[PDB]
UniProtKB/Swiss-Prot annotation, chain A:
GO terms for cellular component: axonemal A tubule inner sheath; axonemal microtubule; sperm flagellum. The chain holds residues 16 to 118 of 273 of the full protein. The gene is Cimip2b. Expressed in airway epithelial cells. The keyword Cytoplasm applies. This is Ciliary microtubule inner protein 2B.
From Swiss-Prot, chain B:
This is Tubulin beta-4B chain. Widely expressed. Expressed in the retina and the cochlea. It comes from Mus musculus (Mouse). Belongs to the tubulin family. GO terms for cellular component: axonemal microtubule; intercellular bridge; mitotic spindle; myelin sheath; sperm flagellum; tubulin complex. Mg(2+) binds at E68. The modification Phosphothreonine is found at T54. Tubulin is the major constituent of microtubules, a cylinder consisting of laterally associated linear protofilaments composed of alpha- and beta-tubulin heterodimers. Microtubules grow by the addition of GTP-tubulin dimers to the microtubule end, where a stabilizing cap forms. Below the cap, tubulin dimers are in GDP-bound state, owing to GTPase activity of alpha-tubulin. The gene is Tubb4b.
Swiss-Prot record, chain D:
Microtubule inner protein (MIP) part of the dynein-decorated doublet microtubules (DMTs) in cilia axoneme, which is required for motile cilia beating. It is found in: Cytoplasm, Cytoskeleton, Cilium axoneme; Cytoplasm, Cytoskeleton, Flagellum axoneme. The lineage of its organism: Eukaryota, Metazoa, Chordata, Craniata, Vertebrata. This is EF-hand domain-containing family member C2. The chain holds residues 214 to 350 of 750 of the full protein. Microtubule inner protein component of sperm flagellar doublet microtubules. Residues 13-129 form the DM10 domain. It comes from the Eukaryota. The gene is Efhc2. It comes from Mus musculus.
Swiss-Prot record, chain F:
The active site is at E254. The gene is Tuba1a. The modification N6-acetyllysine is found at K40. This is Tubulin alpha-1A chain. Gene3D superfamilies: Helix hairpin bin, Tubulin/FtsZ, C-terminal domain, Tubulin/FtsZ, GTPase domain.
Length: 87, 425, 107, 129, 430, 439
């Protein structure tokens, strides 16, 4: 768990730490922080793994009507919007 | 990359100190200045508005320029006053006293030789400097008069950077100073020439929002500065948060001002909702475009239905879809097309930022450039020239070191500017 | 929908009219609350169940939950006249509760 | 097939297995019983050997006895008729060589392995047991 | 041996390329960390321990669009020296990306381009990815292709673009960038494809049932079109065409290198049970006028040629039936002097599918490349929106102030106006 | 190869298509998911369903039908019914506002928005064809899109397709029972348009099927399910010789050759002979004779018109089941011998015979029994002129004071199309005097 060398961002205690390669300093800093608290729910560095009625079957992709809570779901296929709204 | 935030005046500190209670809650920073946040994007681009000190602490980039020591002593003892470094609270001894010429010429000119030492110090501790800011009101002589002399001498040292000013221009309805038009008419003589940017906020319409749509019985000067601080951060959120589509501070200044004198804008804010009608309100993309664009929700009291939109922004803030955002900017433009200029065939600028303001699921922020900003400038010059035709209060300025021909020189540049808005209408 | 509050606490006065067994619920006026206040429920007999039974003054005590029109009111305290009346009718009153403090109003 | 070295070099770099050696040439006419040392390098499974000389023997100074190389399993093998020792095969010249989809320049040469050698057993070292 | 390096410019060029490189990883066996658990050499270099480095370079001026590739799931896949990043952004200014900030990075990127193509054995194509809206997608791209036009020579340089739409746009300046960038793309690109954002919203709404398509679904459709061109580089076909061979066949003249694209089965996975997906069913869905990628109707056009590219379970006897069908229907009009009219391409490998994507796992697929006279009305629309604002000089003060003369605004108008009559004089019959 | 595309328009036309497609899915072995169960299969090969169904790689059977409607509700019970997966989603087409019982609304204002979608879907069900025997349409004259859009449907099919056959099964209004005030104004104009574009036209009014449900069966209070279940028994028997093998069989162009003598007389009647509840069926012989003269009962015809007032032109016979060819000829010779049945002068043969082998199937939940024989009649009288002497009466009873005319004019319809259609419909009244009188 480290950062790649060209990275242009903020790493705590980086300016005060010295005398190593950049990736080695970032790995050692991300491993632990005696001075402060590192956040628990983080989302930059992630593990690499390869990319009554009305169920999801009871309709067609041209069906007209009201499906509850399915006007706020976006970027998905119509059956997928209906599936993750109903279930 | 990064910005240094100047604050000037008794309005300027009370505008400015609330903004640092706002943007330090973007980044999980407690009042002593230490990060205690809950995500790594609360920390990742924090150097845009900061400098770092020893011990796991960050201090802002701000100087706090006043002409009375008693108006920052409340700011140094607020809830978020001890965050600032006390080296650059550079302050005067005697008062300007609602006087232009005692801020520009006589008294502030001794102080500004010492203000430049720290703003040159905050502008050499950088990586690649991006811009500055300025908070001031166009009524007095501490916020308004020295802040004008501040800008021009920044401009001759750092002439390819970005200057912003967040004005609070004087109102017609009730005036809290007798000599307001002698301030604001000589003031905009250098907001037409010396700055890259300037906004326009009336206190007349900040009252109109805080009674019609927010249902406040009694708004203080804290609830009005909540409205300003939620827009002064909305134009610097592509610069410190990643986006699906990006439009940072330089990208709008090139793109919106069509001609090099017409840089007076009028902002709003979309999810502004009454506390009883928060429950009965849906938040979709059409429910931001419906409330960005309506003439009630402006913060400038210059009615857009009385003129032509020139160039129109929208910096959205949430997790939206790029069709539905681009649909409504097409839908509004085709419905009422008389209100928009026709020799600019699409008056839309769009941006989407992936990190909302905290507590809100979705937001938006608007920057109009309408034709009807001349009715601010015309109605200053109708009540300026009542007083100047008989020379009511002139002896307090002429006795501090300025001539008579400088005022009819200032009435040239303001009454030129009204014509250059009628020219392109 | 609020970023500042997840729930709010609304104080109400419940009036029971011994003349006709009717009830009314009235929110007191609070400065700067921003909500429509005053008469929440008009004077009428409140139904206790789907059978059409009405609330009697015998069903009302400190620390009881009163459910009317899908709202649940926690009875916290009563006035001196109500206390003396219920005790004179042989109802033992529960200890007075404290109204919980509204987080939003405190902030 | 695999022509890869880097994983084994990163995994087993400095590890060798050493066995001392005794060899009775007393069955021959004039040889004495000999003490040798047999190193086995785990980076590439390659073997080297050296002689251990007594206090009173008239043998010259030897820092080796053979080469650090791979030892064949059976006999001094006939790997002659040169050209067959190349591991990869070719189809034409187009230098730039094209890999032939069949494999014709392949001879089954067996080598000693760390699975093969052990304590207290006898092996064949270039025709010597 | 089949070397091909793709350089990405623009924020748009990176989210296009972030979908192509999750497609080329899944198509072969490799993982986000580069390690397989024969023909990857078209797009992957070869290092020691089982790594395969992509043959790419991601260059954009602002830092905030590459920094989630530096921290995303593909940190270790790209070599860090490729992700070139500047400091200050062009900010919707062709002048600022071509004259001011582009001069501080063109020295560095051409070092990485040299360090890639000296490792290569023999090079066919460059695939640059950009968009005709902003600054670094339009200005830096122009400076990139006059360096590459003379530093490298006659290596083929492809060009995947996005045209600005007729109505639905996101800038008020979008005509000004896209009449000054046809000046330099014409003399340097060998084939320049156009796919505008407006038409994909229709196809994502009625063929696929995606109401509200975000740009993640938009860019998962472009990557199928780029991959289907290059499946004949990487795989073995019954009748294959390389990137060199159909550049000859597609363009008549050295100024008419603007083809269209169409991908025929673009079908949701619930409505793909019921359809046969035969070869003659999807050959004519390419020429359906509601399925094109650029908003210009082919019924007003006049076809020069067509480059069908097929992949999957296709047999050449089923191909020649459908080609004879299209030449008999009378709403399709080829020109007088193109009697053959077609360039068949038949491949063996089916198109791979991304999990979390939007399409269906289909046995056959068609990608189509047409060259019509129908794009005369996609360049006579946006040419008016240019000089509607240029007739009294809106937004010229920004462009002049950092390196552009006043005359080059109209030097590129006539080279787009003389561009237009070459499409009038190519469609006439005898 | 013997294919026929079905189209259905309106709330009457959809609810006919439910009863016909529960019939065909049980006539062959189709389950409501779409495929034969692969545990048990009934007899026959691939040939018996390709007139109606399609195929994919997995083995689905998607019907060649499209349902057209102008409101959401009536389609949406097909989409949530037990046959939701058996129909492909684009085949069930649905507008947004219905035509509000106007001919003019469905033909000029609203019908232009769903004529563009429904003409690419036929061209997607006729490109996958190899040889198409002819379309079938299903509508009701009284309705708004069953009258307005359906006339607009037939015209664009005469142009784009040609002489390909277009059958129509229609619902004529009853003589006095009706659900709508406007019904004279629709059935005049829609008869004016569907004259020149339709090839055959089996009109049936609902009041006659009311009378034979209560009498021949015992079912008092019938709904439209019992009305539609008997209609599909007649639609299937027309095409029963296309699908299953017969002793002597007729196709869709066989009866148009024989029934229709002149190019505007194409209005046959309909009679289904054994219509018996299961408590009476097994005590009766039900021979070929007993189900031949029962088609000639004037109380068993399915239009409220009386063939004693008119001349028979040409009668079609559709025999299925346990029918021997030699017993059709015995019962035919009784009819021409009988003297209360009158034929025209210039047609001495007067009969087409069709004999099939497959006996008619039973729908569970239905009311008819399992029988061994049946006869379907397609007569052609001159006595259908009396069902237009009471339609032209109820038209000018309104129209001579201009009632309801402003509702139709303001939809792009000029006022001249009422006087146009009244005279053309009066032309067909004298075409039946002229043809049906003796030389």
């Amino acid at each position: 768990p480290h950062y790649i060398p060209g990275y242009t961002g903020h790493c705590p205690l980086l300016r005060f730490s010295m005398g190593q390669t950049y990736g080695q300093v970032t790995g050692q800093l991300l491993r632990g922080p005696p001075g402060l608290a590192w956040p628990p729910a983080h989302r930059t560095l992630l593990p690499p793994i390869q990319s009554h009625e009305r169920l999801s079957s009871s309709i067609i992709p041209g069906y007209t009507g009201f499906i509850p809570r399915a006007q706020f779901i976006f970027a998905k296929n119509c059956n997928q919007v209906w599936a993750e709204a109903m279930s | 990359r990064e910005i240094v935030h100047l604050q000037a005046g008794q309005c300027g500190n009370q505008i400015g100190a609330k903004f640092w209670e706002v943007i330090s809650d973007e980044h999980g920073i407690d009042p002593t200045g230490t990060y205690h946040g809950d995500s790594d994007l609360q920390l990742e681009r924090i150097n845009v508005y900061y400098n770092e000190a020893t011990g796991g602490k960050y201090v802002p980039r701000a100087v706090l320029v006043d002409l009375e020591p008693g108006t920052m002593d409340s700011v140094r003892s607020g809830p978020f006053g001890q965050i600032f470094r006390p080296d650059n609270f550079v302050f005067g001894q005697s008062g300007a006293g609602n006087n232009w010429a005692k801020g520009h010429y006589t008294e502030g000119a001794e102080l500004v030789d010492s203000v430049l030492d720290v703003v040159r110090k905050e502008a050499e501790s950088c990586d690649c400097l991006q811009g500055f800011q300025l908070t001031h009101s166009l009524g007095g002589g501490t916020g308004s008069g020295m802040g004008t002399l501040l800008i021009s001498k920044i401009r001759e040292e750092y002439p390819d950077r970005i200057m912003n000013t967040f004005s609070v221009v004087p109102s017609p309805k009730v005036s809290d100073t007798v000599v307001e038009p002698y301030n604001a008419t000589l003031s905009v003589h250098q907001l037409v020439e010396n700055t890259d940017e300037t906004y326009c906020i009336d206190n007349e319409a900040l009252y109109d929002i805080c009674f019609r749509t927010l249902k406040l019985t009694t708004p203080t000067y804290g609830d009005l500065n909540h409205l300003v601080s939620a827009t002064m951060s909305g134009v610097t959120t592509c610069l410190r948060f990643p986006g699906q589509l990006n439009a940072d501070l330089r990208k709008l200044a090139v793109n919106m001002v069509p001609f090099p004198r017409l840089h007076f804008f009028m902002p709003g804010f979309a999810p502004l909702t009454s506390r009883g009608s928060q429950q009965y309100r849906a938040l979709t993309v059409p429910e931001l475009t419906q409330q960005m664009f309506d003439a009630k929700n402006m913060m400038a009291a210059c009615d857009p239905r009385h003129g032509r939109y020139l160039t129109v922004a929208a910096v959205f803030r949430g997790r939206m879809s790029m069709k539905e955002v681009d649909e409504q900017m097409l839908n509004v433009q085709n419905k009422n097309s008389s209100y928009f200029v026709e020799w600019i065939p699409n008056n839309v600028k769009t941006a989407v930022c992936d990190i909302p303001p905290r507590g809100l699921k979705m937001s938006a922020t608007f920057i109009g450039n309408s034709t009807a900003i001349q009715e601010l400038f015309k109605r200053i010059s109708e009540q300026f020239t009542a007083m100047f035709r008989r020379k009511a209060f002139l002896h307090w300025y002429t006795g501090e070191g300025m001539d008579e021909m400088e005022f009819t020189e200032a009435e040239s540049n303001m009454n030129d500017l009204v014509s250059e808005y009628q020219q392109y209408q | 929908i609020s970023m500042e509050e997840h729930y709010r606490i609304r104080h109400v006065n419940i009036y029971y009219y011994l003349e006709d067994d009717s009830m009314s619920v009235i929110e007191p006026v609070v400065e700067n609350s921003g909500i429509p206040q005053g008469k929440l429920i008009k004077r009428q007999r409140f139904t206790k169940n789907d059978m059409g039974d009405h609330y009697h003054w015998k069903d009302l005590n400190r620390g009881i939950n009163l459910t009317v029109y899908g709202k649940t009111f926690r009875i916290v305290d009563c006035d001196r006249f109500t206390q003396d009346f219920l005790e004179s009718q042989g109802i033992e009153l529960n200890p007075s509760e404290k109204i919980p403090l509204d987080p939003y109003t405190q902030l | 097939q695999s022509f890869d070295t880097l994983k084994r070099f990163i995994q087993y770099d400095g590890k060798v297995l050493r066995f001392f050696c005794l060899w009775d040439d007393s069955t021959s006419l004039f040889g004495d019983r000999r003490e040798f040392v047999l190193h086995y390098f785990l980076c590439d499974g390659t073997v080297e050997i050296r002689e251990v000389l007594p206090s009173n023997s008239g043998r010259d100074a030897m820092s080796s006895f053979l080469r650090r190389g791979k030892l064949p399993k059976y006999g001094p093998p006939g790997i002659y008729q040169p050209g067959q020792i190349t591991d990869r095969a070719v189809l034409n010249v187009y230098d730039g060589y094209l890999l032939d989809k069949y494999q014709l320049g392949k001879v089954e040469q067996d080598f000693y392995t760390d699975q093969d050698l052990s304590i207290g057993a006898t092996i064949n070292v270039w025709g010597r047991k | 041996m089949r070397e091909c390096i793709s350089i990405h410019v623009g924020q748009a060029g990176v989210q296009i390329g972030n979908a192509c490189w999750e497609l080329y990883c899944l198509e072969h066996g490799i993982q986000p960390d580069g390690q397989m658990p024969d023909s990857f050499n078209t797009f992957f270099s070869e290092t020691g321990a089982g790594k395969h480095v992509p043959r790419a370079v991601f260059v954009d001026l602002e830092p905030t669009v590459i920094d989630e590739v530096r921290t995303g799931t593909y940190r270790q896949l790209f070599h860090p020296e490729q992700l070139i990043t500047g400091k200050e952004d062009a900010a919707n200014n062709y002048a600022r990306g071509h004259y001011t900030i582009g001069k501080e990075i063109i020295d560095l990127v051409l070092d990485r381009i040299r360090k890639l193509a000296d490792q290569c054995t023999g090079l066919q194509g460059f695939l640059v990815f950009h968009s005709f809206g902003g600054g670094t997608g339009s200005g830096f791209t122009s400076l990139l292709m006059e360096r590459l036009s003379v530093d490298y020579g006659k290596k083929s340089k492809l060009e995947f673009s996005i045209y600005p739409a007729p109505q639905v746009s996101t800038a008020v300046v979008e005509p000004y960038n896209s009449i000054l960038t046809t000046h330099t793309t014409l003399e340097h690109s060998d084939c320049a494809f156009m796919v505008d954002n407006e038409a994909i919203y229709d196809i994502c709404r009625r063929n696929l049932d995606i109401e509200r398509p975000t740009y993640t679904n938009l860019n998962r459709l472009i990557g199928q079109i780029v991959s289907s061109i290059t499946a004949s580089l990487r795989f073995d076909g019954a009748l294959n065409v390389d990137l060199t061979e159909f550049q000859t066949n597609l363009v008549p003249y050295p100024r008419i290198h603007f083809p269209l694209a169409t991908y025929a089965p673009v079908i949701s996975a619930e409505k793909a049970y019921h359809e046969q997906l035969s070869v003659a069913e999807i050959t004519n869905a390419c020429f359906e006028p509601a399925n094109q990628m650029v908003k210009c109707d082919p019924r007003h056009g006049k076809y020069m040629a067509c480059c069908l590219l097929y992949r999957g379970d296709v047999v050449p006897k089923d191909v020649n039936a459908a080609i004879a069908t299209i030449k008999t229907k009378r709403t399709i009009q080829f020109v007088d002097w193109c009697p053959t009219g077609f360039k068949v391409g038949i491949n063996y490998q089916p198109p791979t599918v991304v999990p979390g994507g939007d399409l269906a796992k289909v046995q056959r697929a068609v990608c189509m490349l047409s060259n019509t006279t129908a794009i005369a009305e996609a360049w006579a629309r946006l040419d008016h929106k240019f000089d509607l604002m240029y007739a009294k000089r809106a937004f010229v003060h920004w462009y002049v102030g950092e390196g552009m003369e006043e005359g080059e605004f109209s030097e590129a108008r006539e080279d787009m106006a003389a561009l237009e009559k070459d499409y009038e004089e190519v469609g006439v019959d005898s």
